[PDB]
Ligand binder design. Structure first.
Ligand SMILES: Nc1ncnc2c1ncn2[C@@H]1O[C@H](COP(=O)(O)OP(=O)(O)NP(=O)(O)O)[C@@H](O)[C@H]1O
Ligand SMILES: Nc1ncnc2c1ncn2[C@@H]1O[C@H](COP(=O)(O)OP(=O)(O)OP(=O)(O)O)[C@@H](O)[C@H]1O
Ligand SMILES: Nc1ncnc2c1ncn2[C@@H]1O[C@H](COP(=O)(O)OP(=O)(O)O)[C@@H](O)[C@H]1O
Ligand SMILES: [Mg+2]
Length: 1083
């Protein structure tokens, strides 16, 4: 066979090509064939250049296959095996075979230059053929490849596909003929391909569908997972042909069951082709469509296909099973355009995608029901198809890639299966008849290009996991690999293309569905039975005769009945949530975080009523008292769940709004926030300030009593702490530095009897290994018939992990914190995977409680929205004036117990320590300088300061106390200042505050301007004059010259002061050229 075109005359190399994709011979394809064959006749190379997805490489492949020549497409995107490319060029030259480089532009410059030199040598050797004088009876053509004279066959050729934006290297510009494949002719491809599927009308369908894809491309919002190129269009047309043939066979079988004669042409003639194509387009696109783009897509579809609509296929059996399972698991179900219609549609789309593809993804935002949709689908197909459904949930970023896929031991060769490989091997072996069962492996975590490299082969049509051990695991047809991801920001397009997709937009789960789920869970789940009765929930399909499973069920049912009016679609909770979303919060506010926090608080409310009934066995709670209590608690929990993450002013704003919209009475005191009030066990409100005792501290522990001085901010938060620890929810506390989250959390946790606090401090290098080490330290694994359970060694104690800085762990390159995802999988799935043995282990009595600083701070990072959904976040602002006054009044009263003559001045002093401090906090801010930061840590450092000036001294006058107070004020606040006028303001304001709070104390004796305190001159820490201190420091400096460093150091006014400040800080506890000098002097 000889294939000829214009001058070119090739011979057909009879190479077996299999069922290779045929290309519609469009005008651009004909032009490309013409120019490429002309170049090959001239022995020049071919360069079809153009935008991405314009048929370049596959047109070259089509031309090579038309002449029967072996084509070898070389990719040029981070997978370019250079070490084989010299060998591959030698093979191409010797055997005779074509080589095409897809996007040769994408090569790095070194790679580009080297391959360019190789191709230049080859093409010069090929061009040496073209001269006529060279007789080929004796012509051993050769080229220099791999330092060898390799013979070149004439049939061989090389093509280089380029992407403009550009040109070829200057080496090959003279040698390669270029062709612009700028725009393939979509209409003719669609026409020929639709006519290939048997569509009676193809010109109109092609001329409609082709502009529609372009219209979708421009109009719809840009998303990575969308694809409206020629590949997607051709896949849509194949699916349309399949739907058409299915309809032919449906009508045929319907007639055959009855009494009729069959002829395929008659049935095919009378059908709507537009409806079939539209059904295919919708079935293939709408699952991927974001909720914002679906009505735009339907509008464009109506415009391009007028008077044609897509009626969704009715799956009555699956829908009934879905209704049954949803009623079983306290989930709202709908039949479309109802409460929960979109979610039902999405789970049905998930079923379709699982049926078609063997790999799929769910790409909603956090809190859209993708995990619940998948679970409901599995448990519904359970009853529908009579096949047991099993789920293997893996958080892939939590585990390392090596343990995920198993690593070959570099020495003493032995294979250790990874977790995913262990699951696949277990399924393939089928020790328990796993092949009979249906198994879905769900990667429930962020997807990255690193851990999906081995999964690319599995997700593709190969369905073969290749391991470095050399074992090739074939995926059985029962296995389905699924993905849950909040987003696909860092996913390669290669991964997305292989997988089907269902986008679960956040407006698939309405607030009404979550409220219905909460109330249904309240009405049927006893809140004290826990996990022992959790199995029995499945024993009864309706639990008849078990309405009074406990008094807990009855009381919480009454509470739910009381709460129903406020949980409506336009109730108090909905409006409160909508307003709260307008407020700015230190952490990103998610809907389900607020809702889970509120549900936990209401759970604790009904628990409190149960406690009241237990403590009043004779006359338990009446329904009126219950109504008042729950009505007030709902407002209290609404505030503390929504505005709990905001400043006091915004909490007051939300309280004002609730006062505006609510019907429940609120307190009748004008200048008190609602958050300051508690709901007592009786329905009436009561201030929190009544529940905060005034205590007295010992002098021994005056500045570090690890017991928190009870203030308002401490009697509130601890209550909330308990309300969120009874439910085992992972509490988190945030706030500016020094606020007191760590002490408050430690005291609240240690106050409980059962809790065992384990103090972990997180940092940038912390990983899952830290938590695992803590578990091996305090906890242990035990085997049970249910499975492996991790438990604390101490029986009957709830072990809690304090994660002191949850924010600080560094993100990976792809915006995921490993330890945070690990904790997320624990708190959500109630366990993790032992990687060493590759098996699921369940936590029994493990909890997490975190502290943070706001994410705006430099070393911090924002937390994952999948993780922030579980944790309730509280914002501990600074204590403020009254709280500071109480906290440090107790400390000053303890401090003055040393000298009994100044006890009466304890309270006048404390207010001063507050007032000036607050004034500084209002005058100097972080904007002026980054280090102008004030907190209660200053005040303790004030207290401690005075303490270590008062501890050795046997007695003082009040003026001495004022002088020490002023000295510590200057040493803590004046030193940090940068500007001289600020220092002068501090000088004047210390005097103003002191004389305001200490009238009839003469200022001249009490506070002379040159305030210096030193311990070198005398044994005690008492004031001294400037000249004596100058002389002592000068003598010691002269000694220092000839001792450690032999250089002159001059003493001026502004260096003696720094020496004294450094020595002072050396004398305090936890006190953090001149530094070396003062360290030497003080030893
Ligand atoms: N109610 C209080 N009673 C006593 N001291 C308090 C109180 N509130 C705050 N403090 C002081 O606040 C300082 C900081 O408390 P601490 O909890 O130890 O730091 P922190 O809250 O963890 N700050 P950080 O961990 O950096 O975000 C300590 O010196 C406490 O004495
Ligand atoms: N069909 C439903 N009807 C009612 N409530 C539902 C339904 N589906 C989910 N919910 C509620 O919404 C919650 C979130 O569902 P799901 O756990 O599947 O979310 P998700 O989007 O996967 O979240 P995450 O980002 O935490 O992984 C469920 O715990 C349940 O409270
Ligand atoms: N003339 C054509 N006939 C049929 N299909 C085509 C034609 N041109 C392009 N295509 C399709 O468009 C897609 C283009 O991808 P490909 O040619 O591999 O990369 P690029 O076009 O970016 O060089 C292919 O899936 C191919 O099937
Ligand atoms: Mg999920």
């Amino acid at each position: 066979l000889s294939i000829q075109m214009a001058n070119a005359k090739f011979n057909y190399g009879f190479e077996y090509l299999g069922v290779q994709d045929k290309l519609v011979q469009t005008p651009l394809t004909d032009r490309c064939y013409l120019t490429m064959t002309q170049a090959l006749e001239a022995r020049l190379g071919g360069s079809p250049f153009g935008p991405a997805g314009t048929g370049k490489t596959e047109s070259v492949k089509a031309l090579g296959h038309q002449l029967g020549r072996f084509v070898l497409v070389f990719n040029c995107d981070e997978t370019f095996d250079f070490q084989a490319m010299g060998r591959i060029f030698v093979g191409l030259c010797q055997v005779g075979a074509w080589g095409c480089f897809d996007e040769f532009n994408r090569l790095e410059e070194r790679m580009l230059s080297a391959v360019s030199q190789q191709v230049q040598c080859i093409q010069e050797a090929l061009r040496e053929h073209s001269n006529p004088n060279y007789d080929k009876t004796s012509a051993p053509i050769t080229c220099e490849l791999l330092n060898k004279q390799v013979k070149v066959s004439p049939d061989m050729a090389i093509f280089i596909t380029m992407n403009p934006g550009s040109n070829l290297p200057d080496n090959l510009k003279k040698l390669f003929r270029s062709l612009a494949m700028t725009k393939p002719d979509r209409q003719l491809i669609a026409q020929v391909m639709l006519y290939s599927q048997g569509f009676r009308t193809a010109e109109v369908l092609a001329n409609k569908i082709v502009p529609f894809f372009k219209l979708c491309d421009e109009q719809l919002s840009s998303q990575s997972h969308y694809d409206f190129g020629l590949r997607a269009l051709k896949s849509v047309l194949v699916s349309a042909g399949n739907v058409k043939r299915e309809r032919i066979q449906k009508i045929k079988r319907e007639k055959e069951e009855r009494g009729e004669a069959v002829d395929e042409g008659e049935i095919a003639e009378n059908l709507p082709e537009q409806e079939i194509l539209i059904q295919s387009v919708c079935e293939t696109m709408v699952p991927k469509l974001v909720a914002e783009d679906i009505p735009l897509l339907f509008s464009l579809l109506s415009d391009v296909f007028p008077g044609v609509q897509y009626h969704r296929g009715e799956m009555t059996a699956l829908r009934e099973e879905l209704k049954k399972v949803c009623q079983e698991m306290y989930l709202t179900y709908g039949d479309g355009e109802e409460v929960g219609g979109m979610w039902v549609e999405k789970v049905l789309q998930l079923y379709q995608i699982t049926q078609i593809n063997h790999g799929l993804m769910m790409v909603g935002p956090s809190g859209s029901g993708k995990s619940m949709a998948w679970r409901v689908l599995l448990k519904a197909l359970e009853r529908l198809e009579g096949v047991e459904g099993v789920a293997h949930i893996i958080d892939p970023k939590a585990i390392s890639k090596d343990h995920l896929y198993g690593t070959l031991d570099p020495n003493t060769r032995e294979w250790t299966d990874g977790l995913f490989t262990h699951v696949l091997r277990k399924i393939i072996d089928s020790v328990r008849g796993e092949l009979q069962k249906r198994q879905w492996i769900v990667f429930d975590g962020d997807v990255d290009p690193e851990w999906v490299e081995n999964l690319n082969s599995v997700l593709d049509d190969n369905k073969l996991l290749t391991l470095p051990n050399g074992e090739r695991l074939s995926l059985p047809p029962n296995v389905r690999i699924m993905f849950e991801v909040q987003d696909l920001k860092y996913a390669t397009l290669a991964t997305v293309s292989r997988c089907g997709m269902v986008w679960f937009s956040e407006d698939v789960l309405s607030t009404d569905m979550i409220f219905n789920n909460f109330l249904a869970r309240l009405r049927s789940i006893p809140l004290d039975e826990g996990e022992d009765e959790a199995q029995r929930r499945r024993k009864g399909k309706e639990d008849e005769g078990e309405e009074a499973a406990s008094p807990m069920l009855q009381i919480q049912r009454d509470a739910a009945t009381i709460m129903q009016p406020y949980f409506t679609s336009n109730g108090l909770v909905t409006k409160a949530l909508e307003h709260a979303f307008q407020l700015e919060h230190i952490m990103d506010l998610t809907r389900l975080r607020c809702l889970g926090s509120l549900f936990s608080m209401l759970h604790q409310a009904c628990r409190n009523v149960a406690q009241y009934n237990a403590n009043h066995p004779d006359f338990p709670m009446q329904i009126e008292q219950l109504e008042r209590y729950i009505q007030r608690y709902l407002v209290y929990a609404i505030l503390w769940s929504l505005s709990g993450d905001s400043r006091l002013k915004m909490r007051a704003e939300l309280g004002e709004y609730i006062r505006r919209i609510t019907t429940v009475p609120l307190p009748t005191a004008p200048n008190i926030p609602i958050i300051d009030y508690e709901v007592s066990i009786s329905g009436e409100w009561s201030p929190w300030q009544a529940k905060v005792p005034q205590i007295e501290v010992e002098t021994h522990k005056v500045a570090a009593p690890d017991v928190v001085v009870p203030t308002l901010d401490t009697v509130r938060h601890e209550a909330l702490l308990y309300t969120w620890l009874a439910e085992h929810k992972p509490l988190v506390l945030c706030g500016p530095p020094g606020s007191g989250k760590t002490m408050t959390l430690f005291s609240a946790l240690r106050a409980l009897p059962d809790m065992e606090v384990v103090g972990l401090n997180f940092s940038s290098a912390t990983t899952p290994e830290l938590l695992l080490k803590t578990f091996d330290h305090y906890c242990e694994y035990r085997r049970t018939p249910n499975g492996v359970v991790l438990a604390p060694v101490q029986l009957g104690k709830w072990l809690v992990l304090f994660c002191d800085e949850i924010n600080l762990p560094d993100m990976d390159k792809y915006g995921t914190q490993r330890v945070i995802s690990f904790i997320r999988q624990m708190v959500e799935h109630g366990g993790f995977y032992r990687t060493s043995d590759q098996t699921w282990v369940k936590l029994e009595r493990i909890q997490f409680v975190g502290a943070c600083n706001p994410p705006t701070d430099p070393g911090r990072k924002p937390l994952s929205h999948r993780f922030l959904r579980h944790v309730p976040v509280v914002y501990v602002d600074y204590p403020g004036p009254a709280s500071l006054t109480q906290i440090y009044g107790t400390f000053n009263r303890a401090m003055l117990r040393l000298i009994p003559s100044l006890r009466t001045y304890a309270e006048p002093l404390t207010a001063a320590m507050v007032e000036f401090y607050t004034m500084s906090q209002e005058r100097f801010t972080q904007d002026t300088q980054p280090h102008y930061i004030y907190s209660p840590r200053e005040m303790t450092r004030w207290v401690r300061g005075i303490f270590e000036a008062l501890r050795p001294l046997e007695t003082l006058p009040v003026e001495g106390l004022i002088r020490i107070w002023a000295h510590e004020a200057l040493r803590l606040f004046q030193d940090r200042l940068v500007e001289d006028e600020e220092r002068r303001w501090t000088d004047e304001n210390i005097d103003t505050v002191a004389l305001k709070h200490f009238p009839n104390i003469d200022r001249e004796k009490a506070m002379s301007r040159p305030i210096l305190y030193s311990n070198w001159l005398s044994k005690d820490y008492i004031p001294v004059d400037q000249e004596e201190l100058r002389d002592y420091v000068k003598a010691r400096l002269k000694v220092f010259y000839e001792e450690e460093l032999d250089v002159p150091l001059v003493l001026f006014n502004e260096v003696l002061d720094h020496v004294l400040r450094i020595d002072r800080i050396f004398r305090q506890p936890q006190g953090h050229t001149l530094s070396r000098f003062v360290a030497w002097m003080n030893g």
